[PDB]
Design a protein around this ligand. Structure first.
Ligand code: HEM
Length: 377
């Protein structure tokens, strides 16, 4: 019985770990051994990965962990913050923050670290605006969010970065209980006012949103941009594209390719479950593995290929499937749309500043990324 997870390859470093991709060639599903030493069921094939995500005999063992109607409770509370018009309305400020950040990057020296100057700051600012942190508190919020993800930060640094983030979100929650605007925390604040969640639970959740949608999107920006640069054929397409429909699909094809969230929360089966030709005896653990699904040649004809015109690209599960899909979905999509198109058209001479093999990737972090991305232009 093999060990999970497995490590990515040099020379194929965008690719899912080859050892996982092999396993996935044999059986839509195989039994693995993990950190603690328990032996859960790694789901690899696309068709069955979607199924278990959408199967009630399956559930997850705060809204991250909460399940049952307990999850519907937590997740209904999140509907108002990420409606369509609620995210639509953010496209402008996503575009102003990007434009701002690209400028400051152009005005500085080069080679410049795209991670440092763009990939990290833009999500946490966008998350911020969605929450509704006042303008006054942008840089402090930024600081206490970018202290965590620094490759140079202590653990203590990361602790007393999060401590004051929870402390501040509680403040702003109460503040939005007082003065509700149209932002996200006002919505959480509206829920404290109805006996539904304490300030702590709301501060936790606000904190929860920042974490969830920061290093993820950051990593999509960074890795995404890199992937674009070694694939100039595609960079051109994304840059000259004239349809919002087509640029949206090119984001979908980037989420599928990079598949930064390789895993997916560790679920468990309540009843016995028969697919892939084996039986998931109830009780046993389930790991619904998204990279190999996104790289399943049954549904994505040339999975090693980065084809931004790829026909069914929003077929992927880079955001998960079923109950517990990424709540950030539409917002993160806007982010990558904005940032990708805008960088690629304002900086058409953007060039990778080192040999690719020099680039530092984020192996250990569950979410795959690059630690810094030097560009010239
Ligand atoms: C706007 C930015 C984002 C926000 C606010 C956000 C927030 C969240 C939250 C709260 C959840 C938990 C929902 C639940 O499990 O009930 C979640 C799940 C998830 N997120 Fe996102 N996220 C963001 C961006 C991303 C990105 C960019 C990716 C991948 C490229 C991603 C991948 C996922 C996946 C795969 C899940 C589902 C985990 C599972 O079903 O086990 N997220 N997100």
């Amino acid at each position: 019985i093999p060990d999970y997870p497995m490590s990515r390859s040099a020379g194929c470093p965008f690719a899912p770990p080859p050892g996982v991709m092999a396993l996935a060639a044999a059986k839509p599903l195989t039994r693995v051994r993990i950190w603690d030493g328990s032996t859960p069921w790694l789901i690899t094939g696309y068709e069955q990965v979607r199924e278990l995500f959408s199967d009630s005999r399956v559930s997850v063992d705060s809204v991250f962990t909460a399940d049952g109607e307990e999850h519907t409770r937590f997740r209904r509370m999140l509907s108002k913050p990420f409606t369509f018009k609620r995210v639509e309305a953010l496209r402008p400020t996503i575009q102003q923050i990007t434009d701002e950040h690209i400028d400051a990057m152009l005005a500085g020296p080069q080679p410049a670290d795209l991670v440092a100057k763009l990939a990290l700051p833009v999500p946490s600012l966008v998350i911020s605006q969605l929450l509704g942190v006042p303008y006054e508190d942008a840089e402090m919020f930024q600081h206490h969010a970018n202290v965590g993800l620094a490759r140079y930060a202590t653990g203590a640094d990361t602790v007393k970065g999060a401590m004051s983030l929870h402390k501040y979100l509680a403040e702003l929650v109460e503040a939005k209980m007082a003065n509700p605007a149209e932002d996200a925390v006002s919505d959480l604040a509206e829920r404290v006012k109805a006996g539904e969640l304490s300030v702590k639970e709301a501060a936790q959740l606000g904190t929860g949103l920042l974490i969830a949608g920061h290093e993820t999107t950051a990593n999509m920006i960074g890795l995404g941009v890199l992937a674009l640069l070694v694939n100039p054929d595609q960079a051109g397409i994304l840059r000259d594209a004239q349809d919002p429909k087509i640029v949206a699909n090119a984001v979908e094809e980037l989420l599928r390719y990079l598949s930064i969230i390789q895993n997916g929360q560790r679920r468990v089966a309540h009843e016995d479950i028969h697919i892939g030709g084996e039986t998931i005896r109830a009780g046993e653990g389930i790991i619904i593995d998204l990279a190999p699904a996104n790289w399943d040649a049954h549904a994505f004809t040339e999975p090693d290929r980065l084809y931004l015109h790829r026909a069914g690209a929003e077929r992927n599960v880079a955001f998960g499937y079923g109950r517990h899909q990424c709540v950030g979905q539409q917002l993160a999509r806007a982010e990558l749309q904005i940032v990708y198109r805008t960088l690629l058209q304002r900086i058409p001479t953007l060039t990778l500043a080192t040999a690719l093999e020099d680039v530092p990737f984020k192996d250990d972090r569950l979410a795959y990324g690059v630690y810094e991305l030097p560009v010239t232009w």
